[PDB]
């Protein structure tokens, strides 16, 4: 399912891009001949008038051949004879179509309802502080409500995450933090963690003390703790947060534990021995927290507006990532090669189809942004070539044209091999 899902994803993406190219071209009286999808020997081709469609064997890329692109043909249907601005529009049609596709699928997903954890929308209340972390070190007591950082005013945990990732990308270190408790806005000087590489603020949201799953073969499974049941107390200790149950289990360290479980309206004093698991010398109970999720369905117009906003935010984030990469801020190992695309597509497919759709939107946006950079033998380089010819009024020298095309082919090839070996390195771990 994974490999075929990756294949169909790459196929629909390249088809959308080349179809945008083709429709923009047909809206300007040109003749298209090759509609090659991918590379290698064409697996099968069907002819319909001038437009001969084919599909090839190796689906990595895809390119389209027109009539009179750069040849010295004076026929009106020749692409070379066309005005430079129309050629620029033809070049931009691809990424523009990709962006339109991403916005449309995002809006469709939003209208169909997205499933998100409920804590992602509730007000920012710190239900648990990680021990000896930045939040604890600065002095964030549990139950404190964060109202502002730097910037981006925060009201939802999603807003806090977005502000944190933006601050990490911006390379800010010391940040003013307006935190509220008992009507006191206590300004603090927080240290922004490099959330790009994993480290976080050590702030946890409120989580109800209820079990949603149990590992089969776990001692809790042998005791009889079925999933979907809430737990009242542990050894009589008043606990109102699942993280407090986690703390109690962590401090048990193998001691016999008497869990007062509220079994759907009745109290059971279950006895457990969560000893030090020989796998890591750690407490083992084989439990799963009960995750809570909500499905949202925005109004169609409001869904479209939200999709536009999200597309703008993701475009800004990708542009910032590109700028950081060109400045050395982010290492080259974070690039996503086609094999990484395959593995993440398989992960999305096994996750579901709506996650598959949103990941398709994100990767389509990534492809559209990538194909816009100024680079020979790319959907962005020809824009630069035609703009140069337009501003100077004459075509680029033919020898310079050959040099430009050759160096572009070389750099594309070498970067593809580099990202390929990066993919193999990722596969190794």
């Amino acid at each position, epitope marked *: 399912m994974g490999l075929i899902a990756f294949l169909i994803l790459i196929g629909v993406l390249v088809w959308v891009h080349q179809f945008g190219h083709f429709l923009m071209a047909k809206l300007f009286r040109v003749k298209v001949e090759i509609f090659s999808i991918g590379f290698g020997p064409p697996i099968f081709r069907r002819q319909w008038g001038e437009t001969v469609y084919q599909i090839a064997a190796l689906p990595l890329g895809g390119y389209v051949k027109l009539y009179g692109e750069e040849e010295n043909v004076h026929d009106p249907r020749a692409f070379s004879t066309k005005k430079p601005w129309q050629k620029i529009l033809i070049a931009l049609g691809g990424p523009l179509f990709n962006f339109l596709f991403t916005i449309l699928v995002f809006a469709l997903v939003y209208t169909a309802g997205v499933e998100v954890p409920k804590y992602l929308k509730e007000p920012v209340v710190v239900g648990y502080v990680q021990r000896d972390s930045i939040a604890q070190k600065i002095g964030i007591k549990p139950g404190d409500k964060i109202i502002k950082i730097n910037g981006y005013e925060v009201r939802t945990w999603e807003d806090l995450r977005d502000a944190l990732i933006r601050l990490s990308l911006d390379g800010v270190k010391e940040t003013t933090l307006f935190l509220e408790r008992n009507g006191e806005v206590l300004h603090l000087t927080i240290k922004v963690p490099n959330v790009q590489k994993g*480290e976080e603020l050590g702030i946890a949201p409120l989580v109800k003390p209820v079990v949603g799953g149990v590992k089969k073969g776990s001692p809790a499974d042998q005791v009889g703790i079925k999933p979907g049941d809430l737990i009242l107390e542990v050894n009589g200790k008043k606990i109102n947060t699942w993280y407090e149950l986690v703390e109690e289990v962590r401090k048990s360290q193998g001691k016999a534990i008497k869990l007062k479980i509220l079994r759907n309206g009745k109290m059971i004093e279950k006895e457990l021995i969560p000893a030090k698991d020989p796998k890591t010398g750690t407490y083992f109970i084989g439990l799963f927290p009960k995750t809570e999720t909500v499905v949202e369905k925005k109004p169609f117009g409001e869904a479209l507006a939200s999709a536009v906003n999200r597309t703008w935010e993701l475009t800004v984030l990708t542009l910032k990532t590109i700028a950081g990469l060109i400045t050395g801020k982010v290492s080259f190992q974070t690039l996503g090669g086609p094999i990484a695309i395959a593995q993440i597509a398989g992960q999305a497919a096994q996750s579901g189809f709506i996650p598959y759709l949103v990941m398709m939107a994100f990767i389509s946006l990534q492809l559209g942004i990538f194909n816009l950079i100024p680079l020979p033998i790319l959907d962005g380089g020809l824009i630069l070539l035609f703009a140069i010819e337009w501003l100077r009024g004459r075509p680029l020298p033919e020898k310079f044209k050959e040099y430009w095309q050759r160096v572009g082919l070389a750099i594309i090839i070498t970067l593809t091999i580099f990202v390929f070996i990066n993919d193999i390195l990722r596969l190794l771990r």
Partner: antibody, heavy 124, light 108 residues
Framework: GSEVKLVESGGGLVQPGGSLRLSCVTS????????MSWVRQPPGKALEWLAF??????????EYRASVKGRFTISRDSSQSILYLQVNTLRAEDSATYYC?????????????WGQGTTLTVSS | DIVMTQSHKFMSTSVGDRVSITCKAS??????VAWYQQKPGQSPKLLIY???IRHTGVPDRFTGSGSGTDFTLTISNVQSEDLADYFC?????????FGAGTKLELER
């Protein structure tokens, strides 16, 4: 302002069974905002963490290595940026270089700035 | 408690080469690991924390990697000012523990 600076004092030769207090004078940073520790470095042996003390907002609580609890005491001065470490019942195994250190604010205590260290020799 | 085991007490290298210093934890510590450098007669100096985050002011030659139990400090393009002792440290659980250290020896 001045850069981070830590200077230890109180080392020297001390007979077994005695007591003394080591000092660490700090400068260049707000003293009450950072964890302080007394990790030790014996000659040609690995580092041994001894204790650390939390900030003002955390009640100045202390954490100790189990082997030295009840023997070693870490503390801060009331009105000066000076850290102290009282040590009693000294034995020959305590002879080492004692380092005072300022920790970063990241996740979990690590030591971002170290003092020069002071050498203690315990023998009769 | 948690024991940080550096299998090599000495490691040979030349100026301009790459060195990989290994460190093995007694149990899973995730990524709560820091690395330090100590030159003769000087205090230790933190280079990397969280397995892969370079400290401010540390040159790009020092890189850390690894997760779980087999963390590694790689020094690309060894310069002459790197002849020193390098050791790891974990802060996943108390008490905090250090490695025994690794001394850089020059080849000839």
């Amino acid at each position: 302002g001045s850069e981070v600076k830590l200077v230890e004092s109180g080392g020297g030769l001390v007979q077994p069974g005695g007591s003394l207090r080591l000092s660490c004078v700090t400068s260049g940073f707000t003293f009450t905002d950072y964890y302080m520790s007394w990790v030790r470095q014996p000659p040609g042996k690995a580092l041994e963490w001894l204790a650390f003390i939390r900030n003002k907002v955390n009640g100045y609580t202390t954490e100790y290595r189990a082997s030295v609890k009840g023997r070693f005491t870490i503390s801060r001065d009331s009105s000066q940026s000076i850290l102290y470490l009282q040590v009693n019942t000294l034995r020959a195994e305590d002879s080492a270089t004692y380092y005072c250190a300022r920790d970063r604010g990241g996740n979990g205590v690590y030591f971002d700035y170290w003092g020069q260290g002071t050498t203690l020799t315990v023998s009769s | 408690d948690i024991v940080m085991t550096q299998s090599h007490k000495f490691m040979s290298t030349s100026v301009g080469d790459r060195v990989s210093i290994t460190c093995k934890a007694s149990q899973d510590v995730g990524t709560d690991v820091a690395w330090y450098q100590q030159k003769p007669g000087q205090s230790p100096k933190l280079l990397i924390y969280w397995a892969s985050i370079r400290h401010t002011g540390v040159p790009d030659r020092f890189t850390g990697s690894g997760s779980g139990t087999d963390f590694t400090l790689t020094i690309s393009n060894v310069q002459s000012e790197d002849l020193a002792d390098y050791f790891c440290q974990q802060y996943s659980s108390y008490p905090l523990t250090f490695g025994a250290g690794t001394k850089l020896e020059l080849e000839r």
